[PDB]
Ligand binder design. Sequence first.
Ligand code: TRP
Ligand code: TRP
Ligand code: TRP
Ligand code: TRP
Ligand code: TRP
Ligand code: TRP
Ligand code: TRP
Ligand code: TRP
Ligand code: TRP
Ligand code: TRP
Ligand code: TRP
Lengths: 69, 68, 68, 68, 67, 68, 68, 69, 69, 68, 69
Amino acid sequence: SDFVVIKALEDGVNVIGLTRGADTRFHHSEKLDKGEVLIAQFTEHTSAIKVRGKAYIQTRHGVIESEGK
Amino acid sequence: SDFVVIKALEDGVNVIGLTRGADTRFHHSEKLDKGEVLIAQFTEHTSAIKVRGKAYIQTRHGVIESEG
Amino acid sequence: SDFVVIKALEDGVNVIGLTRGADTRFHHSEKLDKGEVLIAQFTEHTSAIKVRGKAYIQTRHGVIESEG
Amino acid sequence: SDFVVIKALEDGVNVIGLTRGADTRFHHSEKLDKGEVLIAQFTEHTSAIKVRGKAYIQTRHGVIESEG
Amino acid sequence: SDFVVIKALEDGVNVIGLTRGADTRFHHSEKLDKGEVLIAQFTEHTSAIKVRGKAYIQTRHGVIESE
Amino acid sequence: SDFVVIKALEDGVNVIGLTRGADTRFHHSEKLDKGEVLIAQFTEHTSAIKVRGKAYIQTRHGVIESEG
Amino acid sequence: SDFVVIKALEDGVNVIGLTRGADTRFHHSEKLDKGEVLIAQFTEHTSAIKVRGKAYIQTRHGVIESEG
Amino acid sequence: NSDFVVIKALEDGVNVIGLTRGADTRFHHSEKLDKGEVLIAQFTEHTSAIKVRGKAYIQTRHGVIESEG
Amino acid sequence: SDFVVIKALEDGVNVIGLTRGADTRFHHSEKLDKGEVLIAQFTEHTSAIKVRGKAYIQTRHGVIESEGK
Amino acid sequence: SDFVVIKALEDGVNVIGLTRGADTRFHHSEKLDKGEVLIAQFTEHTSAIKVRGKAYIQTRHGVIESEG
Amino acid sequence: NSDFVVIKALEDGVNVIGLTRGADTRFHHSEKLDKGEVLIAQFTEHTSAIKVRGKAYIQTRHGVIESEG
Ligand SMILES: N[C@@H](Cc1c[nH]c2ccccc12)C(=O)O
Ligand SMILES: N[C@@H](Cc1c[nH]c2ccccc12)C(=O)O
Ligand SMILES: N[C@@H](Cc1c[nH]c2ccccc12)C(=O)O
Ligand SMILES: N[C@@H](Cc1c[nH]c2ccccc12)C(=O)O
Ligand SMILES: N[C@@H](Cc1c[nH]c2ccccc12)C(=O)O
Ligand SMILES: N[C@@H](Cc1c[nH]c2ccccc12)C(=O)O
Ligand SMILES: N[C@@H](Cc1c[nH]c2ccccc12)C(=O)O
Ligand SMILES: N[C@@H](Cc1c[nH]c2ccccc12)C(=O)O
Ligand SMILES: N[C@@H](Cc1c[nH]c2ccccc12)C(=O)O
Ligand SMILES: N[C@@H](Cc1c[nH]c2ccccc12)C(=O)O
Ligand SMILES: N[C@@H](Cc1c[nH]c2ccccc12)C(=O)O
């Protein structure tokens, strides 16, 4: 199963897993501070992942960068 | 199972799931504000995804950009 | 399964799913306005997809363009 | 399962499904007008496809063009 | 399952399917006129394909031409 | 299953299927006239294939030619 | 099944395994001294791994570096 | 779905020999090729090693090799 | 299943297997002296591997070096 | 399932199959004379293969030469 | 269908040591190689780690490495 790499570029970044199934809502928000890396899979319980905050992201499709409000 | 990366390029972008099955209708619309990134799989419930508003999109077939 | 990306280059583009099975007919027509993007799988219900209107399309086989 | 992309380069192009099985006959013919694209899988019911009329075709093996 | 692309370069091209199984015979011959393309899989009933007539052929192993 | 492409460069080329199993013998010979192409799989019944006569052969491991 | 390589660039790097399942919390923390390497899989019990502290990280998607 | 070897005889009397799969190893078949004939032969439920004797041009997934008589 | 290659660059390198499952602990420490090579899989019993000591390491993601103590 | 190509570069090259299983010993030695080629799989009975004598060897990891 | 390693002895008395798969880890076999011999050895039901002692040229799917005596 695929995974995404997320490196926080400032404090307070949130990687949010959205529930798998007919229902779509946030089940968990993992908070990352500046410099930390989260490597997160898609799973039975998480079928979409949202990133809020400034972060450097790698997936199988390449690099992308989230920008904070 | 594949996924698509969506980065919002302005406020109020909508990433819309369409139901898998005999029936095709919306089911969920995830609102992304500017700079937010959503990475979303195809799933038992979602077999098509629409993007509305200005966003940078990556799939296994390359980059594409939606326009609001 | 494989999926196709379709970006509407003008208003009222139709992405039409043809039923899987012994019978072949349209079960669903998804209208895209200019600039919208539809990322759509082949599925248990859909074994062929037809695009009507000006659009930019990506498949595993590369780029192709439908014209109005 | 594999698919073929067909872009009609003139009106009245026919994309014809041939039946899977001991029997071989045409079970469906999809008519494409100029600039329409059809992306069509091999399936339980369709194990060979025939294109008649001027079209641009992509498959896993590359590009080929049918002529009217 | 893999497929072959055949483009007829002249009228009257035959794409012939050969039976899978202990015995080998032709069970279908599809006629292609000039410019028509057939894309044909190997299947439960067809384990070999013969092309007669002038055509441009593509497979996973690249291009070949019948005459 | 893998397949082999054989193009006959002279009349009378033989493409010979050898039986799968503890016994090895020829079960079929398909005769090809100059310029005919045969695309033939390995199968439940055919675990080796022999070619006699002048032909251009393609397999997954590249081109080889047989000579009469 | 995928794995990540973590090389500690200073003492006390913390590799944190998050529980697979409807609930998310950490179930194990493996500390690495400077120059030590951990090569760790995604598993039935771990579906996300967080790195705290200065580390050089390799995954299938390339190199990334955590900073303390 | 198994791998296969291509053997082109470069002289008469080339032998492609199949060795039995299983606890017993022996030759179970020897296919004679004359000059310029080609044999494309799979590994099988009965054949888990293949010996070539005589001068032949051989292709496997590992590339070209040549046997010498 | 994946494996890692470890070549000891000094005496006394440890290649340590961590238990698969809900419990995580070391279950084995393989000592390598200089110049010895260990090629070790992930397994039903080992889902993470730690190297301590100076070693040259190859994985499917490429070369990494552990630095000694 | 993998295979090794062995080309004898002198007479009496010995290709030795080691038993799969909890015990390890040789169960077959196949001698090759100069210029003969053996293409041998790993199998239910052979999980390690030893070559003695001068031989040119291909495996999926490249070429290697034994020295006799 | 497992991975395999290629070991070529560069001196006499090289040892290719198979380690037991499973909860317990011990040497179950040491195959001794003399100079110039090549062993091609799979990972298996019984062997989940392989140790090489002595001077040898090694190939695996991650590249070449050399053990030293
Ligand atoms: N318990 C969660 C852990 C997780 C994996 N990937 C995530 C992405 C975002 C948030 C949480 C997660 C799960 O198995 O799904
Ligand atoms: N619960 C939804 C989550 C989701 C995944 N991909 C999406 C794309 C668009 C909207 C929602 C989704 C599902 O599993 O299908
Ligand atoms: N409910 C439809 C959704 C769909 C997927 N791909 C499409 C292409 C065209 C039209 C509809 C669709 C299905 O599961 O098949
Ligand atoms: N109902 C048809 C739809 C179809 C798929 N590919 C085609 C090619 C040609 C004609 C029809 C089709 C089927 O599932 O087979
Ligand atoms: N009914 C035939 C159709 C077919 C597929 N490929 C072919 C090649 C030649 C002739 C017929 C065919 C089958 O499923 O086998
Ligand atoms: N009926 C034969 C047809 C065949 C397939 N490949 C061949 C190669 C050579 C000769 C015959 C064949 C079979 O299924 O095996
Ligand atoms: N009847 C033999 C035919 C064969 C396949 N590959 C071979 C290689 C050599 C000799 C014979 C063969 C088998 O199925 O195994
Ligand atoms: N008996 C251990 C052997 C082993 C494999 N890889 C390892 C890595 C480190 C330590 C021990 C091992 C197991 O099967 O898991
Ligand atoms: N017992 C843990 C070991 C582990 C694997 N990968 C990890 C990553 C982080 C922390 C622990 C681990 C497991 O099998 O899941
Ligand atoms: N009967 C043996 C034949 C064999 C295959 N590969 C070998 C390598 C060496 C010696 C014998 C063999 C087997 O099936 O295992
Ligand atoms: N009987 C051993 C043979 C073996 C394979 N690879 C090895 C590596 C080292 C020592 C012995 C072996 C086994 O099946 O596991």
